């Protein structure tokens, strides 16, 4: 149906950050009318749509333009192949209304070591305490999906 909630911008606040730092996004959205159910924003680590990182619920949805901060926990280096700790990965930020995904924003992420010398000379055991992630916020991929909101047809 006609789209009640719309995403307006995303700021990637703490960027670049340590691999193990939480993610902090300021999210702007506009809600045109009272809705019956919750929004769920979630953050998914993709790498490769593998692992859900965190999720925040909003209900009841405030009407109008609103800004909030979404603090999402970082991926665990333990549930990740060492191959992917110092390469390019993807995070997926998405919103659902009543369990129905209507927007999805993808970012590429560069993961690289702290200092030049360590960049040029990777140790065979990966030192996660020295990996700095850098989300490429400048170039998002935005995908929307027409969904049924509160008016059944």
């Amino acid at each position: 149906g006609s789209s009640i909630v719309s995403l307006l911008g995303i700021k990637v606040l703490n960027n670049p950050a340590k691999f193990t730092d939480p993610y902090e996004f300021e999210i702007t959205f506009e809600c045109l009318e009272s809705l019956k159910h919750d929004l769920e924003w979630k953050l998914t680590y993709v790498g490769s749509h593998d692992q859900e990182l965190d999720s925040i619920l909003v209900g009841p949805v405030p009407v109008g333009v609103n800004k909030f901060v979404f603090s999402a926990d970082p991926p665990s280096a333990e549930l990740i192949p060492a191959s992917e700790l110092v390469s390019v990965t993807v995070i997926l930020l998405s919103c659902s209304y009543d369990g129905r995904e209507f927007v999805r924003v993808g970012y590429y992420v560069n993961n690289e070591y702290d200092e030049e010398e360590l960049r040029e000379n990777p140790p065979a055991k990966v030192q996660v305490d020295h990996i700095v992630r850098n989300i490429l916020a400048e170039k998002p991929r935005v995908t929307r999906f027409n969904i049924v909101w509160d008016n059944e047809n």
Epitope: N15, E24, P62, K67, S71
Partner: antibody, heavy 119, light 108 residues
Framework: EVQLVESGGGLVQPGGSLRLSCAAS????????IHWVRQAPGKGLEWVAY????????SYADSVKGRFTISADTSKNTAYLQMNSLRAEDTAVYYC????????????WGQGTLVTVSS | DIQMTQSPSSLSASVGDRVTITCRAS??????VAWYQQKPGKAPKLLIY???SLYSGVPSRFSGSRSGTDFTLTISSLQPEDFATYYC?????????FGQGTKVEIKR
């Protein structure tokens, strides 16, 4: 040993201007947000502004929009509050504070510097 | 457009009491609520963050809970160094917001 030191405070006329400094030591300012919070005499806590020095992204309270500017010098590990167009009701103790992996709660606080605006 | 409405404004207690300070949010907040203690002439100190996470260092008698849009600071068994002002704080929505405060005062 984490600590933040304010400086810059003092008396200034209505409509004038003052720069506050927040020198951080013991942690890397880049991997956190730095907040300014103020307290008018005998009043509650009021959030003024923040900055993520890594991105340079910032935010202001409506009461301070377009008069106050917040900035960070990542080499000096230091944050600044440039205050312009001061009104008397900007008179307060100004704390800088740091937020890190605490969903924008503030875990360390400066001693606070006092700012008086008066004719 | 968000409020942290904090109750009560003043609160009388003797040592040993279980005291409860309540903060209601004007709209939904998943977890970014924090509680602070300030003493006269001092910078506030963090007590609990993320609604219920005891900050490191803070005595375990301070705890945080949430019921719906009501966030609560509990001090089971109030000690004498606990007479202070307590502020709640929201940092999910713009703008970050402190409650009005609660002064915890000695009973007589």
């Amino acid at each position: 040993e984490v600590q933040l030191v304010e400086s810059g405070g003092g008396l200034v006329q209505p409509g004038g201007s003052l720069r506050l400094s927040c020198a951080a030591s013991g942690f890397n300012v880049s991997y956190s947000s730095i907040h300014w919070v103020r307290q008018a005499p005998g009043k509650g806590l009021e959030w003024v502004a923040y900055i993520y020095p890594s991105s340079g992204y910032t935010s202001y309270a409506d009461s301070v929009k377009g008069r106050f500017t917040i900035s960070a010098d990542t080499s000096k590990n230091t944050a600044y509050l440039q205050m312009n167009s001061l009104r008397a009701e900007d008179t307060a103790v100004y704390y800088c504070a740091r937020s890190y992996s605490t969903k924008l709660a503030m875990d360390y606080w400066g001693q606070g510097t006092l700012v008086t605006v008066s004719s | 457009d968000i409020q942290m409405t904090q109750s009560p404004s003043s609160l009388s207690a003797s040592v040993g009491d279980r005291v409860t300070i309540t903060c209601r949010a004007s709209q939904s907040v998943s977890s970014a609520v924090a509680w602070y203690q300030q003493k006269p002439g001092k910078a506030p100190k963090l007590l609990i963050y993320s609604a219920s996470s005891l900050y490191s260092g803070v005595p375990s008698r301070f705890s945080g809970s949430r019921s719906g849009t009501d966030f609560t600071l509990t001090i089971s068994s109030l000690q004498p160094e606990d007479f202070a002002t307590y502020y709640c704080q929201q940092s999910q929505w713009y703008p970050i917001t402190f409650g009005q405060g609660t002064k915890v005062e000695i009973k007589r």
